[PDB]
């Protein structure tokens, strides 16, 4: 099974260099290369360039001059180099796989991305807050519980609910920005109000640009 | 560089609508353009490529045709799972350029949201702020109004607002209203409500607590 997996810094400070590797399985380097494509926050998709699979590279020609696509077929990863970052290079990286010849230069599986933020400032870890349940967030047989996860910067952060086990009904919202400057967002969950005092919900939350992990215990309020 | 020009950037449908996205290319591309179905928070995925072949496990619902310049995708049967961000690729000539993507919104009929409140958690309190969050759940359209009332007061400058896409199923938005104050403003009143206005609410609906009394 074909996989591509993107690795990054998270906070790259400008005028620094960008430094990525994609880590791929499941098919033959000697038949394969990888693009690398960004996508800018909002925005569409530009390619950068692509490595083949003899060694052969091709540059977007607008950024060739800052960029350095290579191959360590021991490891099964490629890497990108970006140097001079500035705040226009934040953006999600993706690499996609790469066939074809000298006519077509086709991409068919893409990772998962990686998010690059160019700042001056420094990480920050977020503080995780319960959304209690109570009969104020209940509905009949339904109850909404959740975790506001607050003050962190850069994106992203990662929410799952009791290590992976709870996925139905959750809605992780998009991050707002406070005028701090830092990045809050919520995760919400429906589980039935009857489950309240028998199952307990664990919001686990992952800022890697920190290195931050929390597992908090969301407990129902009484009112 | 070849310009792709996706037309239209948005789009709306209803379930079971055919739905059709064109892309111009400024040069002759051959049959060289891949169509990218991209859903929030994901990677984009393989739809078609050369054109018009289907990429294994793709739904027979999805088509493409086209030659030279001008190039259509086809969705015959618009399903709720298919809200996404649609792109065409060029992959004849360097540099691989993409169109500026087609965003596929889902009309689907009004669902009234359900609303939930939470008071601030006492952790938070210790450090000296006091969010507060509503809650609107699995509603459509996404319009909806959502205001603070403190001690029968309306508040503006202290809440933000955070919406979902729509969801891959049902289409339906959910909706967050956080009010944050310090915890010395937050001790000066006692009933913290949140009022909400929508299309499927044949009245406001408020949700309420009293500070300290959970
Ligand atoms: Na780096
Ligand atoms: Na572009
Ligand atoms: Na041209
Ligand atoms: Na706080
Ligand atoms: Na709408
Ligand atoms: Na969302
Ligand atoms: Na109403």
């Known amino acids: 099974q074909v996989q591509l997996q993107e690795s990054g810094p998270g906070l790259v400070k400008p005028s620094e260099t960008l430094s990525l590797t994609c880590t791929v399985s499941?098919?033959?380097?000697?038949?394969?290369?990888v693009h690398w494509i960004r996508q800018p926050p909002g925005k569409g998709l530009e390619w950068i360039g692509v490595?083949?699979?003899?060694?052969?590279?091709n540059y977007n020609s607008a950024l060739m001059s800052r960029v350095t696509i290579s191959v360590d077929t021991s490891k099964n990863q490629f890497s990108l180099k970006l140097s001079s970052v500035t705040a226009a290079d934040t953006a999600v990286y993706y690499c996609?796989?790469?066939?074809?010849?000298?006519?077509?230069?086709?991409?068919?599986?893409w990772g998962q991305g990686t998010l690059v933020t160019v700042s001056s400032a420094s990480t920050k870890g977020p503080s995780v807050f319960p959304l209690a349940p109570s009969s104020k967030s209940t509905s009949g047989g339904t109850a909404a519980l959740g975790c506001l996860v607050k003050d962190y910067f850069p994106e992203p952060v990662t929410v799952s609910w009791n290590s992976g086990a709870l996925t139905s009904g959750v809605h992780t919202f998009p991050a707002v920005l406070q005028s701090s400057g830092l990045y809050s967002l919520s995760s919400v969950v429906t589980v039935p109000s009857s489950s309240l005092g028998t199952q307990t919900y664990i919001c686990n939350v992952n800022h890697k640009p920190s290195n931050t992990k929390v597992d908090k215990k969301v407990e129902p309020k009484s009112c | 560089d070849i310009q792709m020009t996706q037309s239209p950037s948005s789009l709306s449908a209803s379930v079971g609508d055919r739905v059709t996205i064109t892309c111009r290319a400024s040069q002759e591309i051959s049959g060289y353009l891949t169509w990218l179905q991209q859903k929030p928070g994901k990677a984009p995925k393989l739809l078609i490529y050369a054109a018009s072949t289907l990429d294994s496990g793709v739904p027979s619902r999805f088509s493409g045709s086209g030659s030279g310049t001008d190039f259509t995708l086809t969705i015959s049967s618009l399903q709720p799972e298919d809200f996404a961000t649609y792109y065409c690729?060029?992959?004849?000539?360097?540099?691989?350029?993409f169109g500026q993507g087609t965003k596929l919104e889902i009309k689907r009929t009004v669902a009234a949201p359900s609303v939930f409140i939470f008071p601030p958690s006492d952790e938070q309190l210790k450090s000296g702020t006091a969010s507060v969050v509503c809650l609107l759940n699995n509603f459509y359209p996404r319009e909806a109004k959502v205001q603070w009332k403190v001690d029968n007061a309306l508040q503006s400058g202290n809440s933000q607002e955070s919406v979902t896409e729509q969801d891959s199923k049902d289409s339906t938005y959910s909706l967050s209203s956080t009010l944050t104050l310090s915890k010395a403003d937050y001790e000066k009143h006692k009933v913290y409500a949140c009022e909400v206005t929508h299309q499927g609410l044949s009245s406001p609906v408020t949700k309420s607590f009293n500070r300290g009394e959970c």
């Open positions: 996609a796989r790469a066939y074809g010849d000298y006519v077509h230069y086709a991409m068919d599986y």
């Open positions: 490595i083949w699979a003899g060694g052969s590279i």
């Open positions: 690729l060029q992959y004849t000539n360097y540099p691989l350029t």
């Open positions: 499941g098919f033959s380097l000697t038949s394969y290369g």
